[PDB]
Design a protein around this ligand. Structure first.
Ligand code: HEM
Ligand code: HEM
Ligand code: HEM
Ligand code: HEM
Lengths: 146, 141, 141, 146
């Protein structure tokens, strides 16, 4: 992907107001509630049997914060996403055996969480910029699969 | 299939929408054209400017169809029969595009329903919009 | 929905496959693993090399399930109910992957059926494999 | 996209044996039979009411020759397909209004036709190389849609 100067400004302005802890926990939890087959990777995390059990699980919250922290660091490298995420792509394929469709589902849930938090501030042009970003990050994480 | 809980969650959320349904349909369309530019290939006969009268008119028709589907959730294949005929035989929009509009409707609801958009209600609305899309593509071949 | 002609076409094509059904199942799997490497994430415990015992065994089971579906083409939801439970609750394969195996089954049939793989038969087989895939994902949420 | 030297070699070896005029008419016809909503672009072509009416339509056969001719020419230039197909991408977006999903559907029908013609010569490794090719051409034709 390639963002315009206007799209780049919109991404950075909104992100400076994001609580990465809260948004990360909320995004991973809603992935497991809305697309429950994604729970297959998290057998060791304990009770995932109701929406409140998933959202309040300490291991779900800690992993969501970790994943969104790596996403955050990537935003400083928008013209080089494939290089930035190459080592992580390798790891998710060879060690973790995670189907990359999972990264596309998480990107869509993240857009829903940002809209829920920011309301009218998450305008149609701001959404369009974030759609380019999550597609770019999913494609970069998929790129080393073999 | 839609569960009794799904049906209750959808009726509650769409009810809170109320008289904004039309405004929200137009907003969802603009979100789709900006986020997923390939969808613009179906509207070359429209002015796609922000605030366009043609987009506003089409947004009201889409929202009213959703209202009818909620009211007849126990039998959507019959309620949507005329609209499923129109998409299969005339408009002929590729089936991949229905997931794109569905996502943008979900985002529009999230931006307008702070208290109501819980994890369970999010799941129920996603299932409902996928079911409507399945009915609208059911006669394509 | 599968038409009377669709059902005739599917029964004739799968009939010609006959005793080769198992071999064709393994070939379709190999074609999927090479063309679409992300599908290999579901088989980390398998030797996936050409001619492997695990791939031969799995291909036979897939083929036999398709033979059962053809035999029960008027009511596939009930015939495939146990297999749909297994994919939804245990295996948990992402729904996007079913289109990839379906395409590889079509390519395998085309390579083995010079006279039978006409344009009309191609259309009917594609509808059939999509319907099978829809039943196998119907209980996921 | 990421074709290996031995894959580029396998693509070129098979294509040398193809009758481009014949395979083009066959692939466009099968697109319009298997995925009948694609007929929406071709109202001026006349009778498309049955499988035989489509496959033997003289305007369908003539257009398939033009489309596969341009595909064939591009197979000679694998380093930058985005640049090679840029003019045609702009035309399909700004003049013809063709959803790029149509290019992906045609690619999969072409793979089916190649298998039907060549039989056992269209091996699983040869298919994998052609899947990279058709994805690369569809991505290049999609690139100027902004
Ligand atoms: C924005 C997309 C994502 C990013 C940036 C990301 C990043 C990370 C990072 C940094 C780690 C720690 C790696 C290490 O050991 O050094 C990790 C681990 C992991 N990730 Fe991802 N991830 C993403 C999406 C996903 C998704 C969608 C899933 C599955 C649904 C997933 C499944 C896992 C699993 C199972 C682990 C190992 C967890 C553990 O053993 O504690 N990831 N990820
Ligand atoms: C939730 C899914 C959808 C619903 C409920 C819906 C509903 C409708 C309705 C009610 C009409 C007007 C019929 C009339 O009264 O004349 C319409 C027309 C139309 N729709 Fe769909 N639609 C959906 C999805 C889509 C998608 C995804 C696209 C393309 C990206 C699309 C493209 C069109 C077009 C081009 C028209 C004709 C517009 C005009 O010329 O005024 N629709 N639809
Ligand atoms: C036409 C579609 C499909 C059919 C008819 C089918 C059928 C089957 C059958 C009959 C079994 C054996 C159950 C038993 O042990 O009795 C099975 C298992 C399995 N399937 Fe599916 N399947 C389909 C699609 C897929 C896809 C697309 C994937 C993933 C890419 C997949 C992944 C698996 C896995 C991982 C197992 C367990 C294998 C093992 O550990 O031995 N299936 N399937
Ligand atoms: C491999 C992919 C394709 C290639 C390389 C290709 C190439 C071409 C070329 C060279 C032309 C003539 C352009 C000119 O006038 O300068 C053309 C025209 C056209 N193409 Fe494409 N095409 C492809 C796929 C498709 C598909 C899948 C469709 C729709 C189903 C489509 C729809 C059209 C239409 C409607 C025209 C204008 C025909 C007319 O005059 O009525 N193309 N294409």
């Amino acid at each position: 992907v390639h963002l315009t100067p206007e799209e780049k400004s919109a991404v950075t302005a909104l992100w400076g107001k994001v609580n990465v802890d809260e948004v990360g926990g909320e995004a991973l939890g809603r992935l497991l509630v809305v697309y429950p087959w994604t729970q297959r990777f998290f057998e060791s995390f304990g009770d995932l049997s109701t929406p409140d059990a998933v959202m309040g699980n300490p291991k779900v919250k800690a992993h969501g914060k970790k994943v969104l922290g790596a996403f955050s660091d990537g935003l400083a490298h928008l013209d080089n996403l494939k290089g930035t995420f190459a080592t992580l792509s390798e790891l998710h394929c060879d060690k973790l055996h995670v189907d990359p469709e999972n990264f596309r589902l998480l990107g869509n849930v993240l857009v829903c969480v940002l809209a829920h938090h920011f309301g009218k501030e998450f305008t149609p042009p701001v959404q369009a910029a974030y759609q380019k970003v999550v597609a770019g990050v999913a494609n970069a994480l998929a790129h080393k699969y073999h | 299939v839609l569960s009794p809980a799904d049906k209750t969650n959808v009726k509650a959320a769409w009810g809170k929408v109320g008289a904004h349904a039309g405004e929200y349909g137009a907003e969802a369309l603009e979100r789709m054209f900006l986020s997923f530019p390939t969808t613009k290939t179906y509207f070359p006969h429209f002015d796609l400017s922000h605030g366009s009268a043609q987009v506003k008119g089409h947004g009201k028709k889409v929202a009213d169809a959703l209202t009818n589907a909620v009211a007849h959730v126990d039998d959507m294949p019959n309620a949507l029969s005329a609209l499923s005929d129109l998409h299969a035989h005339k408009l002929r929009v590729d089936p991949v595009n229905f997931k794109l509009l569905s996502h943008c409707l979900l985002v529009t609801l999230a931006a307008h329903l702070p208290a109501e958009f819980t994890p369970a209600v999010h799941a129920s609305l996603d299932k409902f919009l996928a079911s409507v899309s399945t009915v609208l593509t059911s006669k394509y071949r």
